[PDB]
């Protein structure tokens with residue numbers, strides 16, 4: 358059974374993470390991990406009041422049991438004083454890759470499954486591995502037939 | 508901590524509860540416990556395609572140190588073949604009265620706290636006793652100031 | 657032409673209606689037109705602090721160019737000091753029926769189309785006649801495939 | 807007089823915008839004007855399968871961070887256009903860019919190559935990232 362994440366709950370969690378990342382002056386800017394961290398990055402940037410937002414674009418595809426990682430666009434630096442935000446961490450693969458690119462950055466997510474959980478600096482919601490997360494940008498409001506009808 | 512419930516989530520839970528009330532034909536109608544149950548009742552009504560929807564309106568008169576229960580408007584029958592529905596059960600204070608008016612009814616809620624759990628026939632979500640549930644009809648979409656300037 | 661009504665927007669509309677119905681003291685209760693008026697009625701009931709909420713249940717099976725009406729259940733009275741509410745007005749068929757069985761009732765809706773427009777006492781939003789209104793209780797948040805491949 | 811925009815509504819408009827920008831292969835990437843364009847840019851990035859998303863941060867109008875090129879083959883996205891102070895500025899850095907917003911006001915209308923929703927000029931747009939689902943007192947007591 359999948360975990361439905363609506364926009365309202367995302368924003369609640371995003372604000373729960375924002376306050377825990379106070380003060381706002383200890384952070385220089387924000388790096389969002391495209392595309393998953395884009396919205397959480399936007400949300401953080403609004404709350405913490407940060408206007409400098411950049412993106413690192415990483416493309417990943419599975420070829421059976423191995424991953425193919427392609428960084429299409431990178432932000433410069435060791436990550437000094439920035440926050441790196443992604444929507445969720447599952448196995449922790451993307452995290453370890455970001456950690457190589459930005460060894461001196463604070464890495465955050467909204468959701469974290471048990472495996473990837475310890476590989477984050479901070480997160481908000483716990484999810485178990487067997488659970489799939491539907492993010493709001495993948496969903497919509499559409500007609501849904503009744504259960505009976507009658 | 509305060510548990511926030513959005514319309515969307517209420518609908519998701521209402522739909523789960525609804526499937527557990529299949530098939531629809533065993534039900535004559537639906538009695539909503541005003542006011543909390545009105546929206547859950549409405550959603551159930553749609554999902555099951557039940558058009559016979561009635562209400563029970565229950566208010567509380569306080570006398571000296573004790574709270575009495577006034578019944579402003581009540582449906583008919585012993586609730587035989589009916590689903591009775593409230594938004595939640597916290598203590599079951601109101602839920603005692605509903606059983607007495609409708610003994611032969613299927614009494615359901617969306618949320619339930621531990622002390623009110625044995626009072627319903629079925630519910631969807633467990634909530635801790637210390638937790639306040641904010642329902643979406645008590646909320647709205649309003650400007651929230653940022654956290655930094 | 658399809659008009660999407662989310663729960664948030666509906667609440668906004670219902671709240672605008674409720675404040676136009678102030679003060680609440682002039683009303684002795686609410687009669688909801690099942691099933692469409694159930695939710696709007698519940699929202700009025702909350703905003704006006706009205707605990708006396710009853711229903712009128714009507715079945716409208718459409719046989720070609722004629723309609724068969726069935727009143728499954730009917731709140732008592734002429735509607736004196738009562739608000740009767742449906743979600744929307746379309747042709748005025750339901751409205752003429754309510755007006756007969758509740759002549760001294762203040763009959764309101766949220767949406768209205770030009771046809772049934774003169775047959776309500778008050779409404780909130782104008783909807784064009786050729787538009788289908790998708791109400792939130794008939795919808796849900798489910799997955800939606802992206803518009804493009806890749 | 808306040809135009810309230812919910813996430814669901816923004817997402818619908820963003821999809822109506824995405825459909826106009828089809829086919830998606832005419833695009834090499836998206837440039838979101840932060841912070842207004844971020845979420846719209848993110849939504850377009852999903853609906854159009856575009857993985858190359860970069861930002862331009864304007865703020866006199868000081869440029870905090872930006873990307874190169876003349877915008878040829880890119881989409882520049884902001885949440886709205888009222889006047890065009892930044893819009894006039896965005897035009898410069900990427901002249902051959904396709905520049906879109908979701909909302910557009912009359913005075914800002916001719917500055918963008920495309921938009922989705924018209925809004926009166928005297929109307930304030932309350933974007934969902936500035937709001938939240940909070941308790942709201944009933945309009946009456948009894």
Ligand SMILES: Nc1nc2c(ncn2[C@H]2CCN(C(=O)CP(=O)(O)O)C2)c(=O)[nH]1
Pocket residue numbers: 393445446447448449450451452473488489490491492495
């Ligand atoms: N929407 C969604 N995307 C998912 C889910 N699980 C994985 N992904 C996608 C999106 C984000 N992903 C990762 O960061 C891979 P990781 O470095 O090994 O943790 C994969 C899910 O349950 N839901």
Ligand SMILES: Nc1nc2c(ncn2[C@H]2CCN(C(=O)CP(=O)(O)O)C2)c(=O)[nH]1
Pocket residue numbers: 692742744745746747748749750751772787788789790791794
């Ligand atoms: N969900 C939905 N229900 C509708 C619509 N149009 C009509 N109905 C349903 C629900 C309310 N209706 C009427 O008041 C019928 P009227 O006596 O001719 O005014 C029919 C619609 O666009 N959408």
